[PDB]
Design an enzyme around this catalytic site. Structure first.
Site: not given
Ligand SMILES: Nc1ncnc2c1ncn2[C@@H]1O[C@H](COP(=O)(O)OP(=O)(O)NP(=O)(O)O)[C@@H](O)[C@H]1O
Ligand SMILES: [Mg+2]
Ligand SMILES: Nc1ncnc2c1ncn2[C@@H]1O[C@H](COP(=O)(O)OP(=O)(O)NP(=O)(O)O)[C@@H](O)[C@H]1O
Ligand SMILES: [Mg+2]
Ligand SMILES: [Mg+2]
Lengths: 346, 350
Positions: A28-29, A31, A33-34, A36, A50, A168
């Site tokens: 889903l993305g 970041g 260091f990790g 998801v 994650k 953040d």
């Molecule tokens: N608890 C959750 N429920 C639904 N979607 C989530 C959740 N946590 C994260 N996501 C989705 O997963 C992706 C990244 O989550 P995040 O915890 O912000 O990690 P990240 O490392 O910043 N990934 P990104 O947002 O792509 O840079 C984003 O699309 C969020 O909307």
């Molecule tokens: Mg994020």
């Protein structure tokens, strides 16, 4: 004579076994260091997972800190962020493959899937789908801004109260949780600091740290200024009062408010333009309105103008140049902007 | 009175117009500071496109440096890396939507698509598919290691010669270029430093920079050590000789060699296990063979064992604990590992 082998110690959450988790292909993305992923827990629970990036320096340690902060928030500020469901750590032989629905080697964190949206995605589709996702009856910029900011500031106040600075805050890290009446929940404590010794501060140090350039004040990318003493259990409270690290989140919250309130500021370039002009006039909202706002003919600032410019005033407080002058999220929550309508004639 | 404003300025490459680029949804990959997509240029050229991550501090500056280094490499070391096709900068109103197949606001870099498979992906499917993609007639671990390392070390030698240290050498950043006879090309100069004043060093600083901890020496995560006069036009040449930042690439290339040579070392876990033992025995290859190799009964070190253990020796040279003892990529090239065998190919030779 050979050295003996021994057991591998793995971290695990009561009630959560590897067999219980199916991971869905397609991140889903990713970041700093990790990564998801979507998952399914115990057959019918939608979750998100994650793990640490294998190609990033210190990734496992960064995830471990995110884990710690997640436990703190789960214990002390329930509801502010996505529901934390714990961790699962897997070994080498015992790990599978993502494209095959199995958890791979290493530490994983798990949360409830709070919704398929983010506020960034929703606001960019429009105020209408945003308001619908938020269950916000007043489906206008003003209406969504009031509801969203009350919720975000309320949660930030609760985080700060237990020593956590999110670091953040932005629309991309807010989800309208449909299962909890559309209320906004924060995600991503990957950059968060614990600024009180409980029993020790976490991810809290002098000088610049991770920041989103769009939502962190450009000359203030630190929680503690570069000259500051390192935090200890003995000086933490003094440092909190002196350097007001929570005011980092205040500025970010102001940026969120600007985007919710003004459709034209929802793109990166839009908000970037505003902030450059805001800086150019000395971080003075009234100066911006007087000297700059005429340049924004393609935008509508009605939500901020409303009710004696209450929206503008709240932005000014959340976005003072000086931390010593900038409102705490708790104080902002009591602003006139959030006053109930008088004489409603029901 | 009112401020007059004026035009926007956008960076562009002659012959490359955004109307001629169709972006395909779905990131090919997400790096540290940027996102890569497949695209189609002028309707029939397969390309790859990279922009900055909006959420990463100075991703903008990093992409500009990657651009600068790509221009340097294009001018000075052609063929070492994915063919660089220039940049395209899009503004706000003219910026589009990835879902609509159009480039979004901001700076983009573009390269030829050099192939759908990385050495990492291929080697993990097997030596067979890797050898096929490499057009490597000797389809054994030794065969592919010889051909691949010759190509990689050659390209690294050329990059070092023009002051560029890649700093992210690994199988994931190598593609067997089908349209150039399967020869390996490096990708991703996003971590690269220009280490000489030509006219200015780029992305070159003391201390730990970015590094893939799998392919960087654990206690050598830097190009210049925290202890050393910041790079300036005057001391640049001296630092180069003193701190040997190119040896960062040497170690990484040794890691590539290990993985190409030994099937068991192709997983993160496998390479990790080896480097840990290697470290444990004092970064001594013979000590490893003497003390540890017996514990690797599931693996086959034949490629390294072959011909008096030449492969093992080249690995030792590339992977010396001390940078002052570690071979340069150029020096590594003349190693016996790369010698044609006696009378090799005699049965068909004219
Ligand atoms: N608890 C959750 N429920 C639904 N979607 C989530 C959740 N946590 C994260 N996501 C989705 O997963 C992706 C990244 O989550 P995040 O915890 O912000 O990690 P990240 O490392 O910043 N990934 P990104 O947002 O792509 O840079 C984003 O699309 C969020 O909307
Ligand atoms: Mg994020
Ligand atoms: N010139 C190219 N031709 C074909 N594929 C490419 C090219 N450049 C990059 N890729 C692919 O795009 C992905 C990432 O490219 P890269 O230039 O390394 O940027 P990145 O931000 O580090 N993404 P990643 O390496 O996957 O984390 C990899 O899967 C590569 O296989
Ligand atoms: Mg941008
Ligand atoms: Mg890469």
């Amino acid at each position: 004579l050979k050295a003996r082998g021994g057991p591998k110690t793995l971290r695990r959450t009561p009630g959560v076994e590897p067999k219980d988790i199916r991971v869905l292909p397609g991140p889903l993305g990713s970041g700093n260091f990790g990564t998801v992923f979507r998952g399914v827990f115990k057959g019918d629970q939608d979750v998100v997972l994650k793990n640490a990036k294998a190609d990033v320096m210190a990734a496992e340690e960064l995830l471990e800190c995110e884990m710690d902060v997640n436990y703190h928030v789960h214990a002390n500020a329930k509801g502010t962020c996505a529901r934390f469901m714990g961790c699962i750590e897997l070994g080498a032989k015992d790990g599978g493959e993502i494209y095959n629905g199995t958890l791979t080697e290493g530490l994983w964190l798990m949360w409830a899937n709070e919704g398929e949206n983010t506020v960034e995605a929703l606001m960019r589709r429009g105020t209408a789908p945003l308001a619908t996702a938020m269950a916000c009856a007043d489906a206008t910029e003003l209406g969504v801004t009031k509801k969203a900011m009350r919720e975000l500031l309320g949660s930030l106040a609760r985080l700060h109260e237990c020593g956590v600075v999110h670091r953040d805050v932005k629309p991309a890290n807010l989800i309208a949780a449909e299962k909890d009446g559309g209320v906004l929940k924060l995600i991503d404590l990957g950059a968060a600091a614990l600024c009180l010794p409980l029993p020790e501060t976490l991810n809290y140090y002098p000088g610049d740290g991770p920041a989103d350039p769009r939502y962190a004040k450009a000359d203030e990318l630190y929680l503690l200024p570069p000259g500051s003493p390192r935090p200890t259990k003995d000086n933490a409270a003094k440092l909190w009062e002196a350097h007001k690290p929570d005011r980092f989140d205040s500025w970010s919250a102001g940026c969120v408010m600007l985007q919710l309130a003004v459709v034209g500021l929802r793109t990166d370039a839009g908000l970037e333009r505003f902030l450059a002009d805001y800086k150019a006039v000395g971080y003075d909202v009234n100066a911006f309105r007087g000297e700059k706002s005429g340049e924004y003919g393609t935008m509508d600032f009605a939500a901020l103008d409303a009710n004696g410019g209450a929206g503008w005033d709240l932005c000014q407080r959340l976005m003072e140049a000086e931390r010593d002058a900038r409102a705490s999220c708790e104080a902002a929550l009591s602003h006139a902007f959030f006053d109930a309508a008088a004489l409603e004639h029901h």
